[PDB]
Amino acid sequence: GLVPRGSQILCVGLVVLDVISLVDKYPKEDSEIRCLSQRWQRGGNASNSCTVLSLLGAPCAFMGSMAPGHVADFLVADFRRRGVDVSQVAWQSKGDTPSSCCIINNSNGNRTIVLHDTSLPDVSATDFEKVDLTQFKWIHIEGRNASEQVKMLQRIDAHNTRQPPEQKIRVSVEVEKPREELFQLFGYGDVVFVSKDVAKHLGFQSAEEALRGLYGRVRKGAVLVCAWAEEGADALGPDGKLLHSDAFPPPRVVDTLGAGDTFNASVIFSLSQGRSVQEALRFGCQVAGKKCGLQGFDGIV
Amino acid sequence: GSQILCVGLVVLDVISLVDKYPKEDSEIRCLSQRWQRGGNASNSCTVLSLLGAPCAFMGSMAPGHVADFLVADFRRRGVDVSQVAWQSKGDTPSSCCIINNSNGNRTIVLHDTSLPDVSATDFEKVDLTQFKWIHIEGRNASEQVKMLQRIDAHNTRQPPEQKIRVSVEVEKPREELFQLFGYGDVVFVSKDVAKHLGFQSAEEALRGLYGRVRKGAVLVCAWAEEGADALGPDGKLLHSDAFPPPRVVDTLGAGDTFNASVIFSLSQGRSVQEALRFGCQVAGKKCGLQGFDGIV
Ligand SMILES: C[C@H]1CCN1c1nc(N2C[C@@H]3[C@@H](CC(=O)O)[C@@H]3C2)cc(C(F)(F)F)n1
Numbered sequence: 001g002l003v004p005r006g007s008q009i010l011c012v013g014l015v016v017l018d019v020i021s022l023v024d025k026y027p028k029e030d031s032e033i034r035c036l037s038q039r040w041q042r043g044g045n046a047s048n049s050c051t052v053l054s055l056l057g058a059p060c061a062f063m064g065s066m067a068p069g070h071v072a073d074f075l076v077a078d079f080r081r082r083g084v085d086v087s088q089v090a091w092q093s094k095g096d097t098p099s100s101c102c103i104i105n106n107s108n109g110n111r112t113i114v115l116h117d118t119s120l121p122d123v124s125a126t127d128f129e130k131v132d133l134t135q136f137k138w139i140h141i142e143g144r145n146a147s148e149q150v151k152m153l154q155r156i157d158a159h160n161t162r163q164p165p166e167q168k169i170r171v172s173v174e175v176e177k178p179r180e181e182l183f184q185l186f187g188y189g190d191v192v193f194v195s196k197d198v199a200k201h202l203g204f205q206s207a208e209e210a211l212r213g214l215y216g217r218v219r220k221g222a223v224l225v226c227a228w229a230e231e232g233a234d235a236l237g238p239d240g241k242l243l244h245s246d247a248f249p250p251p252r253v254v255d256t257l258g259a260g261d262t263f264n265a266s267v268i269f270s271l272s273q274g275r276s277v278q279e280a281l282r283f284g285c286q287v288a289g290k291k292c293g294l295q296g297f298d299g300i301v
Numbered sequence: 302g303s304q305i306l307c308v309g310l311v312v313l314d315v316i317s318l319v320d321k322y323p324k325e326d327s328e329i330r331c332l333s334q335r336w337q338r339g340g341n342a343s344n345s346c347t348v349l350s351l352l353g354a355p356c357a358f359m360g361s362m363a364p365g366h367v368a369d370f371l372v373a374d375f376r377r378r379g380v381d382v383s384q385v386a387w388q389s390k391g392d393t394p395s396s397c398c399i400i401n402n403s404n405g406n407r408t409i410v411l412h413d414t415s416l417p418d419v420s421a422t423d424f425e426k427v428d429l430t431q432f433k434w435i436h437i438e439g440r441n442a443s444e445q446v447k448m449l450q451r452i453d454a455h456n457t458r459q460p461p462e463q464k465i466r467v468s469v470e471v472e473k474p475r476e477e478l479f480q481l482f483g484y485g486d487v488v489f490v491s492k493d494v495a496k497h498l499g500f501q502s503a504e505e506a507l508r509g510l511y512g513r514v515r516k517g518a519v520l521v522c523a524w525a526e527e528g529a530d531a532l533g534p535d536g537k538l539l540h541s542d543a544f545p546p547p548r549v550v551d552t553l554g555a556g557d558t559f560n561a562s563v564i565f566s567l568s569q570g571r572s573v574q575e576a577l578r579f580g581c582q583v584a585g586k587k588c589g590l591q592g593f594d595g596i597v
């Protein structure tokens with residue numbers, strides 16, 4: 001159907017089918033065990049952020065790789081259940097639609113993860129070249145295949161060069177995995193999210209150290225954002241002033257999975273609505289905090 | 302009298318193939334993924350269809366995405382699903398299977414979705430005339446004994462060539478199931494059930510448990526790569542060595558492959574010795590392949 005010009009927030013990244021099993025004790029190899037509870041969930045960073053944007057009242061779209069099959073059918077039906085526009089999905093002829101398997105041991109809270117395989121090709125710069133950008137007001141890219149994503153980012157800048165300031169597409173990038181190839185992405189986007197895990201891997205012991213240490217790597221005018229779980233979040237823009245928001249932990253923490261993606265989607269949402277960096281930071285912390293007291297994303301708004 | 306009926310579980314198995322079994326608290330990447338229709342009776346139906354036998358599946362399912370995949374998979378294999386006991390609430394069983402590629406060992410995390418089992422009531426509604434063989438995977442024992450009593454009652458009223466052959470599998474070490482030993486022409490007892498009863502080999506389990514079967518019945522015990530044994534009314538222990546592949550890649554459903562192949566071979570008029578051997582042969586070929594494609 002018809003999508004009004006400059007109305008959608010696009011999230012480019014991974015969609016994964018997560019099979020989560022809760023067990024009394026971790027299984028011994030070669031054995032068959034009955035779990036306490038089993039759950040299928042749509043995962044992936046860009047994919048979770050789309051869920052959150054839809055629930056916040058934002059028209060949103062997901063761009064990522066899928067292969068036809070029963071995994072994709074479940075994932076597409078889940079995206080639709082969450083009101084996510086799925087028209088920009090890069091359908092593949094080869095590889096598996098990603099699926100992960102999590103075993104959570106109830107006697108100690110330990111999680112054993114069997115990560116998806118790497119058979120599915122990522123969204124390429126040539127796949128992105130074929131996308132009409134006019135329907136998007138904001139494009140969020142989850143860092144994965146960095147050298148291809150740089151070309152996608154250069155395409156958006158080129159688009160923006162011919163647009164008046166009110167038709168200019170806002171851009172955000174997330175550097176969540178501690179992989180060297182991704183650090184080139186710091187130099188792209190209006191808003192750069194760097195994870196606590198990436199920061200710690202670079203030897204930074206706080207969000208402040210992380211923002212001050214990495215601000216020299218962002219493009220002129222960009223805002224660098226770093227969430228540090230229950231220590232809240234920080235942002236640093238061109239004025240050199242470090243901004244901070246404390247976390248808003250729930251009375252009882254129920255489920256933290258996708259709290260970081262909730263934060264990213266909420267920050268993007270708040271910025272797209274014309275709110276200040278300080279306001280977006282606080283809003284991001286509030287919604288991530290509310291999510292932590294909830295199973296899944298139902299009731300975050 | 303043309304079909305082989307298998308009564309039991311249907312499970313959607315979400316399979317991950319790994320280089321080595323993960324250590325607790327670790328994160329590992331898998332080599333490959335796939336979905337497979339599983340469950341003991343359900344796997345035996347796949348094997349029977351591939352062996353050229355008309356077969357039917359009887360088991361519990363609930364409407365949903367899981368059942369849609371399983372039904373399409375049963376249909377794809379030409380397994381008759383008309384006897385499925387559709388339930389109003391729940392999810393249909395699913396599991397997470399970790400298959401270790403270095404040895405073919407499989408580890409299953411099963412979700413028995415609290416779906417009501419097939420009852421004696423559900424089974425009374427079944428037209429037995431189309432079946433030549435009825436295999437029952439032991440689960441809800443007191444309700445399955447009634448199903449088994451219904452088949453004996455049918456057989457009483459029939460000439461010997463029109464009599465339905467019956468097999469029972471006692472796979473889980475649950476006391477409740479041991480009453481099932483006294484029913485069927487062919488009784489399959491697992492290595493896991495045998496070990497739980499303190500038996501250290503297939504020969505010890507067959508000699509120790511033969512007093513529990515019906516008069517004339519054959520007791521069968523497969524012991525994985527040690528092969529399989531059978532003991533009938535003549536008191537002569539029969540053995541078949543296993544047929545291990547040079548590279549074991551996937552063992553999931555090898556036991557069910559054995560049961561289906563034994564049933565198939567016996568339904569074709571072959572001896573117990575020939576059936577054991579055939580069962581070991583097909584189970585062994587399966588172990589060197591991913592899934593059931595190419596077992597024949
Ligand atoms: C995003 C940051 C800014 C404030 N936010 C926050 N992140 C938390 N966690 C736990 C753990 C989750 C795992 C995940 O994202 O999958 C990390 C982030 C927990 C909390 C709490 F205070 F509300 F508890 N807040």
Ligand SMILES: C[C@H]1CCN1c1nc(N2C[C@@H]3[C@@H](CC(=O)O)[C@@H]3C2)cc(C(F)(F)F)n1
Nearest residue numbers: 523525526543545552553554555556559585
């Ligand atoms: C059925 C017996 C008689 C010969 N058969 C045989 N069972 C094996 N296994 C591994 C493990 C599987 C797991 C499962 O059934 O899901 C058990 C049985 C392995 C082999 C092998 F020699 F070919 F390797 N043969």
